[PDB]
Structure formats: structure tokens, C-alpha cells
Paper text:
We also provide two crystal structures of PfAp4AH - in apo and sulphate-bound forms at atomic resolution. There are four molecules in asymmetric unit for PfAp4AH-apo and designated as A, B, C and D. The atomic resolution structure of PfAp4AH-SO4 has three SO4 ions and a PEG molecule which arise from crystallization buffer. Of the three SO4 ions bound in PfAp4AH-SO4, one engages the P1 site (located between loops L2 and L5). We were able to directly compare the active site residues involved in engaging sulphates (or P1 by analogy). Active site-bound SO4 is coordinated by analogous residues (Pf/Hu) His43/His32, Lys48/Lys42 and Tyr87/Tyr82, but unlike PfLys94 analogous HsLys89 does not engage sulphate. Global structural differences between apo- and SO4- bound PfAp4AH were apparent upon superimposition. Three major variable regions arising from SO4 binding and different space group packing of PfAp4AH were identified in loop regions L2, L3 and L5 and analyzed further. In case of PfAp4AH-SO4, His51 forms a hydrogen bond with one of the water molecule in a nearby water network linked to Ser56. In particular, side chain flip in Tyr87 and His43 suggests substrate-induced conformational adjustment similar to the human counterpart.
Residue numbers in the entry: 4 to 21, 28 to 149
Amino acid sequence: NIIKAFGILLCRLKKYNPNKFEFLFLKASYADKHWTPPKGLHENNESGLETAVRETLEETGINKDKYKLLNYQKTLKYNVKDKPKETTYYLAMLLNNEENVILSDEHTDYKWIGSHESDTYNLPESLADLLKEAEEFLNK
């Protein structure tokens, strides 16, 4: 009954400019002002992490050899048309900031955003808070 999705919260260390991380957000092709990390539904015989890795590869062209999976995950439960949804994000750090992002038909744009940009990108509280808490983890 719950729609379950899995994604990689992909981050990178922000380049110097005269909350030090950025997160890869993708703009949905089929929605209005809808930006999320790479994510999607299970396929067969997948752990949540396997699903997250595959969906990230499908949606960005970035495979798991390009990032370091970190010891942080969070499950967000929220409503979509009053239908319960749960999305689990696994934090990973992209080792080369400048990896070429290759979008699929699912998205029209991407942006590496800081946690402070959450309101600008109209993120729901669950996602905004995910970014802040991930940055807290990254600063341990």
C-alpha cells in the first residue's frame, strides 16, 4: 500500500568561494517545480541500496565507482495525493566534483544545490531537513 522508493543523496564538497557541501538535485520532466535527488522504485531482487544505485545510474549516468557510500541514510514518509509514500536516501560523496551528469527523459535539468537553497528550489520540509541533517553528519 505504501509506494516505496530508494535513492542516492549524492553530495560533493563545494568549491571555494570568498554548509560546505552541495547535493545533486534533478528537475522532474513530468512535474511542476519538482526537484529531488536521484531515486526510484525497486526492481526484483534488489536491496534498497541496489535500487538507489541503479536509479542513480539511470537518471544521471553516474555509477557507484564514482562515489563513496557513506554511513548515513534516512527514510522520509510523506503523502502524494493522499497516497502514502516512503523514500529512503543513502548518502554518498562524489569523488570527482566535475563528473558529467547525463539526464534521462525523466528530468529536464539538474543543479548542485546547497542546503540553504532548499526554499528557493521549493523543497518540502522533509527534503530540506534531510539536507541539513546530512551536512551535520558530514561535519563529524
